[PDB]
Amino acid sequence: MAYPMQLGFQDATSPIMEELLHFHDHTLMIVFLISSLVLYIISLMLTTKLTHTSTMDAQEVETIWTILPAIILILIALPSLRILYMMDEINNPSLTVKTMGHQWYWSYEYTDYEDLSFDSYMIPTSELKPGELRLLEVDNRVVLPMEMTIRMLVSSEDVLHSWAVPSLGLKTDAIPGRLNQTTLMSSRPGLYYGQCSEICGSNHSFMPIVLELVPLKYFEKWSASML
Amino acid sequence: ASAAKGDHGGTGARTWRFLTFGLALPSVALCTLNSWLHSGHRERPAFIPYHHLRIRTKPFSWGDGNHTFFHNPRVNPLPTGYEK
Amino acid sequence: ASGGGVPTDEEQATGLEREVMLAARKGQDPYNILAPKATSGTKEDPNLVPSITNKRIVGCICEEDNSTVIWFWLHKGEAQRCPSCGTHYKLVPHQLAH
Amino acid sequence: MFINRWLFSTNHKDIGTLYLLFGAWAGMVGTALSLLIRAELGQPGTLLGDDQIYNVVVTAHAFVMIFFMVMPIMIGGFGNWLVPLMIGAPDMAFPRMNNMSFWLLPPSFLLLLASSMVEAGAGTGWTVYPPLAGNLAHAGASVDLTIFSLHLAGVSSILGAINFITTIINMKPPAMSQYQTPLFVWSVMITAVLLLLSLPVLAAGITMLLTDRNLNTTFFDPAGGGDPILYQHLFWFFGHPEVYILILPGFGMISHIVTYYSGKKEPFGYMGMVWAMMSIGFLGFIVWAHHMFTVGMDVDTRAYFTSATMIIAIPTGVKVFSWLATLHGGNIKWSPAMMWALGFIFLFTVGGLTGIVLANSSLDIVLHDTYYVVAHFHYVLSMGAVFAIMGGFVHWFPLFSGYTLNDTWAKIHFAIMFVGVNMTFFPQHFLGLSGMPRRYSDYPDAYTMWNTISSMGSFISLTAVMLMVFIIWEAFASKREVLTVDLTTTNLEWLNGCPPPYHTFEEPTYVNLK
Amino acid sequence: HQTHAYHMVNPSPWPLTGALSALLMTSGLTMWFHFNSMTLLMIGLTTNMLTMYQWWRDVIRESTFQGHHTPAVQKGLRYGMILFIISEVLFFTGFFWAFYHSSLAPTPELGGCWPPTGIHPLNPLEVPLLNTSVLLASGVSITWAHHSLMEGDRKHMLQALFITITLGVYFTLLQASEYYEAPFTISDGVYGSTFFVATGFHGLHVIIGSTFLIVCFFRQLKFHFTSNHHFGFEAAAWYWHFVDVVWLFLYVSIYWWGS
Amino acid sequence: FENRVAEKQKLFQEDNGLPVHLKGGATDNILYRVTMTLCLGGTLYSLYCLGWASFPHK
Amino acid sequence: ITAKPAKTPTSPKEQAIGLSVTFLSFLLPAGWVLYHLDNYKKS
Amino acid sequence: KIKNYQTAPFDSRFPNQNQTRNCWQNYLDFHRCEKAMTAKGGDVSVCEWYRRVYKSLCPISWVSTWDDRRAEGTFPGKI
Amino acid sequence: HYEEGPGKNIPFSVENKWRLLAMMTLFFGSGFAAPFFIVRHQLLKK
Ligand SMILES: CCCCCCCCCCCCCCCCCC(=O)OCC(COC(=O)CCCCCCCCCCCCCCCCC)OC(=O)CCCCCCCCCCCCCCCCC
Ligand code: HEA
Ligand code: HEA
Ligand SMILES: CCCCC/C=C\C/C=C\C/C=C\C/C=C\CCCC(=O)O[C@H](COC(=O)CCCCCCCCCCCCCCCCC)COP(=O)(O)OCCN
Ligand SMILES: CCCCC/C=C\C/C=C\C/C=C\C/C=C\CCCC(=O)O[C@H](COC(=O)CCCCCCCCCCCCCCCCC)COP(=O)(O)OCCN
Ligand SMILES: CCCCC/C=C\C/C=C\C/C=C\C/C=C\CCCC(=O)O[C@H](COC(=O)CCCCCCCCCCCCCCCCC)COP(=O)(O)OCCN
Ligand SMILES: CCCCC/C=C/C/C=C\CCCCCCCC(=O)O[C@H](COC(=O)CCCCCCCCCCCCCCC)COP(=O)(O)OCC[N+](C)(C)C
Ligand SMILES: CCCCCC/C=C\CCCCCCCCCC(=O)O[C@H](COC(=O)CCCCCCCCCCCCCCC)COP(=O)(O)OC[C@@H](O)CO
Ligand SMILES: CCCCCC/C=C\CCCCCCCCCC(=O)O[C@H](COC(=O)CCCCCCCCCCCCCCC)COP(=O)(O)OC[C@@H](O)CO
Ligand SMILES: CCCCCCCCCCO[C@@H]1O[C@H](CO)[C@@H](O[C@H]2O[C@H](CO)[C@@H](O)[C@H](O)[C@H]2O)[C@H](O)[C@H]1O
Ligand SMILES: CCCCCCCCCCO[C@@H]1O[C@H](CO)[C@@H](O[C@H]2O[C@H](CO)[C@@H](O)[C@H](O)[C@H]2O)[C@H](O)[C@H]1O
Ligand SMILES: C[C@H](CCC(=O)O)[C@H]1CC[C@H]2[C@@H]3[C@H](O)C[C@@H]4C[C@H](O)CC[C@]4(C)[C@H]3C[C@H](O)[C@]12C
Ligand SMILES: C[C@H](CCC(=O)O)[C@H]1CC[C@H]2[C@@H]3[C@H](O)C[C@@H]4C[C@H](O)CC[C@]4(C)[C@H]3C[C@H](O)[C@]12C
Ligand code: CUA
Ligand SMILES: [O-][O-]
Ligand SMILES: [Cu+2]
Ligand SMILES: [Mg+2]
Ligand code: NA
Ligand SMILES: [Zn+2]
């Protein structure tokens, strides 16, 4: 979750979102380089009395400020494209879980073995147990085994939603009739919070996602009890 | 291709008329022959109430709002089997 | 298929369209459809600029393939020159509308 | 002699002015709509009611600014005003079709406003994605009125584009090639071409959505084997060219401002600038799917679309660096216009760079539907497109009205605006990175500081906007007629005085061949 | 008195009456689809019909009788017409995109196949083939009209022009029939949707082109066109050929491959 | 059919200082006025309707 | 850009009126609507 | 019989993020296998794998709906 | 022939600066005002 006065990303819970941190540092580095140059050079032009209003030669420097920006783009593209394939990579998982968006809640389904399924709504502002976060708390949490490659399938049953957990590097639109996939894998147990990342009308701000990651042991036991 | 006929060096409206009457319209006549010569009604398709057909999400703005614009009871059923 | 009965422009073109056609025949451009052909542009042989009034915007293209036209009002009377290259221009009012 | 002038016009200038007047008004609507948004996020909690009436405001904000503010000011106003004056044409090719191009817009706006008064109205976002925009989740004339708004606004722009292209090709002097037209004329033509190809696809897309809502078609409805994604492809295929339609005439005016106020006779690297625009024009058509990295397309496709988006940086960089090369060795007159222009160049560059961030399909996973996007696009529109309009306005206002502005006041305006918009949008970067979604009317607790500061920003912007209305009055109040204009040899638009006659170029320019 | 060759149009109310008629048509549809009345839509159609009659009358008045269409003006009208046709092409492209999207990736609710389960397609070797032969022939005939016109033959221009018009009317009736006798409706899945919107929109452009040819026929009757000046007819022949071609792609896409 | 264009030219090029859209005769003037009337009639009516459409109904 | 002198100069006085009128015309109509937001939900 | 099954593995036939096809196919494969094996005096436990894989991957509302449509005789898939 | 020159080439009169002040005040004022009244009108249905 976001902490007040936050500047950058939520800390990285999955090793994919770690990866996306350092690629962003790499990119921002290049962004500051370029936006500083443009400012400096703007300041360089405005702060001299010297003049040269006659004709200047176009064909000469055009090569430099076309070739360098091309170089620089390759420095951004190479890792961006590496991480892209790394995200989508072959993974043979230990669990499949589905989630369906609705107006205005998420329903989750674990059906490798049984027919374990449940809804999961926001805890309205005026029913929180002191310590509980406004607009981010669900009654039924999505409980999952930590340190294990989990397949998430994301569809919806009404309008578009999108299932986002920023701390994990996940976001996958929920589309009706469409069964979108994404691998989920947490390095650490805990509570991790996300929110609906597409417009669905009335209660779009108020349909959050909370993952609870726990060891395999306590997950298997959570299954039985919910049956 | 170059078709199979001949001309291109005796050009003008004459040629184009020659084509209009010697090719185009005879083609329209042959096709009109063929077509009014596979006619006679095709046995109407046994109704099944498939859920991906006869889509009603909102009444049409005419009639009983269950009848499409060029509706033909001979062949187009409503959502609840054929008419009479 | 050559019967007859379709009028020609000669016959049935009117208005400004006609006057343009009739001009073109003689070799005259009253309504400025052709580009004017330049001269040496010296004091002796200036570029003759037909106007109707007492002034008319000249555009000079000082060197073939310059991407910037040089614009200025040419006034009646004495041959003025371009601010960029000093080629000479003279206004030669009238004719045009007989 | 009034109705014959202002309701029945066949005159590029007066049509320009109507466009400018329509856009002025429209702005105020959008400006008001913008504060209603920041008001609602200015302190934690609800103000208005729910996301529905909020996203009506958000939705209508976007449409009003894009279609009724920026596009009519730039392409309709400055377009109709300057184009013929800059190439020596007595008027546009199709002056009567031109006037309908305008008169379709008030009817279009009316329809859009009616969208928001009936039922709960159009609370879908400017994207108008189904199934939300469908008859089930959005019954009643709500959406169908929006669709018809865009139809009418779509036809305005097309009939205009046909005009601009026809005019700019056909009505130059005999001796003037296209490589001798000013850089603004070039920016309008290209813009027009992007309009002509893009809008028809949108029209089809929203016409298909319409049939889905009313004639029981199932284009987007999985029920009938439809696909919600197919809309996104069709919408975005226009959607991206549009964002380039909104900035290309800016590029044009900025090239003209920077040259004029560093006292060069031409901007640096003309053919390069021309080239850059065409390249940006072309590459803008093969990128649409970079608004769709979270819908679940093939990796290999996302790979393609990442790389293809990035390349635009190159022709755009050529343009940025060329403007600088124009300032180089200039006698820099620090006019209000020139401040707007320099503003553009830095702040635009910044908005563009956050664009390059987002172009990474990998990273965009995390930043899609987050306020980071809202920052990126408010940098290039609110401090890019808009600074270019403001700079255009104050530079050329003398040519339109015949009266000069007060430069002091105009500089006061720049300063206020500059701080406001920056204070408004800069913090949103953090809001985006931290994980605050788009189209939210309340937020978790941690997002409170940055949203607060932001909303305090939007107010300084109001003060600026209000102030400008005064500044224009003041101009007209005092009545300072124009004596003499600088550098008219290389700026034809100024060569018939201020304002120039109803009929300019009755007798056309003389241009030698050689 | 100007000394250039372009046309400075006399102020006209038609832009306003057309823009306003646009409002009524749009309102009127919205009324009809929801609150059930047709009154507005009618009035819109009428104000629109009147705006077009009058705008285009004036264009004829300006050109044929006033002589404002100089070579300059007339070359400008060609660019306009071509550019219009380009946007129209792009418009149709949206509908083909739609069809191809659906038919190459058939969803499970169709049975994962094209055509969908339950859809019985028209036979292309029957009437769609007829229609194809009809329009192509109308392309040959219109071309004959154009050569006759350039050669100054009034009888033959009018004869071939009539033939053309007739073949378009014939297509329209054939199509209106197939529509009625068709065993699927606009409502019957995405097959129906893609089929009827796309063919429907084309059908509409056939009526418009026929109407446009019909106008050229009457203008020709009343001696307007000369052997070198007759843009109205050209513009029509282009539009007609455009229509010819859009049909050809419908045939190959929706009727042949999509069955 | 005979060639009456020669005439129509003369009528339409006449100096009477009326614009092209009324220059034909008195027919135009009515047709013009019918057109405009209806547009204004319609526009008021569509506003009327917008009025109606905003507030819900028992 | 040389300007001629103001034909009808707008005195610091007048300017002050102009500015005020202009800011109220924005700020009242809004403020009124804005003030009554509790009265619109809970009538 | 080749079990000890955790969940549906990766199938190269459906390698991307749109897994719609995966559910649809495996569901068909099963009910085709089930149909065929009853009607030729054989065992249904051979078809059991496809059952698991569709049951795993498919949403429940989808399988609900398809099983309702088969019983109703309006299931658009060839079986 | 239509009127040309400063202040004459616009659909509104800048003859008297206070008449103009009000003109402009109602013009821009309405525009800025309109969204608020919509939000109001929307709230008074339920
Ligand atoms: C208004 C809010 C102020 C908030 C200040 C931050 C609080 C610090 C807590 C101090 C807390 C420090 C301890 C924690 C470490 C943070 C690690 C982290 O999470 O890492 C990520 C953080 C770290 O980012 C930073 O590296 C600091 C962000 C500030 C960037 C420098 C510009 C500041 C200019 C003046 C103020 C802004 C207003 C003017 C805006 C001007 C428009 C560009 O957040 C970002 O990535 C923001 C990305 C925004 C992209 C903007 C594009 C560049 C435009 C500016 C170029 C100027 C260069 C020339 C030189 C400068 C020329 C002007
Ligand atoms: C005028 C409007 C405008 C302009 C000009 C741009 C310009 C660009 N935009 Fe943006 N964009 C929008 C308006 C605009 N955009 C809007 C409104 C949205 C939101 C849509 C919605 O509502 O959902 C959006 C969204 C958007 C997204 C979607 C994010 C998401 O929703 O998930 C992306 C992703 O790639 C993107 C990319 C770009 C890029 C690469 C440019 C390029 O043109 C950048 C060009 C400029 C530079 C790159 C800087 C100048 C160059 C140099 C100084 C040279 C050297 C540079 C380098 C070496 C890098 N834009
Ligand atoms: C041109 C386009 C444009 C402009 C100028 C603006 C201007 C502003 N925008 Fe807007 N905005 C969008 C286009 C624009 N916006 C789009 C497309 C979206 C996405 C919609 C969606 O999610 O669906 C959006 C979304 C958006 C959101 C997201 C809400 C949410 O998702 O939760 C917010 C929040 O702060 C916001 C705020 C602002 C603010 C404070 C301004 C301020 O900068 C406004 C201050 C006013 C001005 C800068 C204009 C002043 C100038 C004139 C009026 C011209 C004067 C006339 C003459 C001289 C002739 N905008
Ligand atoms: C799966 C498919 C796999 C295959 C794919 C491979 C290829 C695709 C096909 C084609 C692309 C190949 C090449 C194109 C490149 C260049 C073509 C150059 C032609 C050109 O442009 O030449 C010009 C045109 O010439 C002229 O007239 C034109 C003269 C014409 C001469 C021939 C005419 C006589 C032949 C018989 C005509 C047939 C009549 C048809 C009507 C019958 C219909 C049934 C030169 O003008 P010119 O001679 O001065 O005119 C003098 C005429 N008086
Ligand atoms: C035979 C060729 C001639 C066709 C034209 C004749 C009459 C209709 C009039 C106008 C149609 C204009 C455009 C086409 C619009 C929609 C496609 C309609 C296609 C059609 O006409 O097909 C009919 C459907 O009509 C229906 O329901 C709907 C009934 C028609 C009214 C629909 C409402 C109009 C929608 C307007 C949207 C226009 C937006 C365009 C924007 C302009 C460009 C910017 C078929 O009937 P069916 O029973 O489903 O199947 C046959 C069963 N045996
Ligand atoms: C499965 C998907 C299905 C969808 C497919 C659907 C349909 C298929 C597509 C098209 C077919 C349709 C109709 C064809 C029928 C008739 C068209 C009209 C033919 C015609 O008659 O046009 C002629 C030729 O057009 C010309 O050159 C052209 C003139 C163009 C002028 C406007 C130019 C503005 C645009 C930019 C042009 C680019 C220039 C080249 C360089 C660009 C670099 C990229 C007219 O010549 P003209 O202009 O007088 O010459 C003067 C020029 N000096
Ligand atoms: C990706 C990051 C971006 C990369 C940016 C890198 C940019 C490289 C910048 C500068 C390179 C150094 C210049 C080298 C080229 C030769 C310079 C030169 O030679 O300068 C002038 C040439 O003039 C002329 O054409 C015209 C003037 C010289 C050409 C330079 C003008 C443009 C410079 C750009 C301005 C800064 C913008 C930088 C963009 C980031 C010298 O004029 P003289 O009076 O002596 O001659 C007149 C005739 N004599 C001999 C008879 C007197
Ligand atoms: C669902 C309901 C939505 C309804 C939306 C309807 C919108 C508007 C309705 C009103 C439109 C019809 C009124 C007639 C318009 C015809 C204009 C025209 O035909 O004008 C011509 C210009 O266009 C040329 O050339 C060539 C270009 C001709 C353009 C034809 C315009 C047709 C209007 C519709 C455009 C459809 C675009 C579709 C593509 C997405 C002539 O130019 P003018 O400057 O006029 O005169 C110049 C003189 O020198 C001539 O002597
Ligand atoms: C229920 C459905 C109904 C739909 C309503 C629309 C119905 C029918 C529209 C039919 C089109 C009629 C257009 C007739 C144009 C007449 C004017 C004309 O033809 O104008 C010509 C000029 O070109 C010009 O402007 C030519 C102007 C371009 C005209 C092209 C118009 C295309 C219109 C398409 C509009 C619908 C778009 C589709 C939207 C889905 C006149 O010059 P010439 O011919 O050279 O003559 C001069 C010589 O006589 C002298 O020597
Ligand atoms: C983009 C271009 C868009 C082109 C224009 C859209 C064209 C829409 C045309 C609709 O035309 C109407 O359709 C009705 C068919 O329902 C007809 O009869 C209807 O009229 C009566 C009046 O309400 C009903 O009560 C009757 O039952 C019913 O048959 C009516 O005559 C006809 O005019
Ligand atoms: C986002 C743009 C808006 C920013 C805020 C604008 C700043 C306020 C300027 C004008 O505001 C006034 O505020 C008063 C509140 O003090 C309102 O009077 C209200 O309260 C008064 C008592 O305090 C009573 O006289 C009135 O009946 C009652 O309407 C009054 O109508 C309103 O014009
Ligand atoms: C050749 C052409 C115009 C020359 C003319 O006819 O005036 C010029 C204009 C802009 C030039 C391009 C731009 O300067 C950007 C690139 C700069 C590099 O120096 C070469 C490739 C590069 C892509 C250039 C190639 C070429 O010299 C272009 C395309
Ligand atoms: C996005 C669009 C399909 C949209 C739709 O489903 O309607 C498809 C059609 C053809 C595709 C392209 C073509 O397959 C060619 C390329 C194939 C490569 O594997 C990816 C990039 C590539 C350039 C594709 C990108 C994208 O997936 C395209 C453009
Ligand atoms: Cu669900 Cu937003
Ligand atoms: O599109 O940015
Ligand atoms: Cu984009
Ligand atoms: Mg999204
Ligand atoms: Na809030
Ligand atoms: Zn010169």
PDB file of C-alpha atoms in Angstrom, chain E residues 70 129 178 214:
ATOM      1  CA  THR E  70     -12.933  28.804 -64.283  1.00  0.00           C
ATOM      2  CA  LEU E 129     -23.442 -13.044 -58.428  1.00  0.00           C
ATOM      3  CA  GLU E 178     -32.692 -10.732 -50.874  1.00  0.00           C
ATOM      4  CA  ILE E 214     -30.384  10.797 -62.351  1.00  0.00           C
TER       5      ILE E 214
END
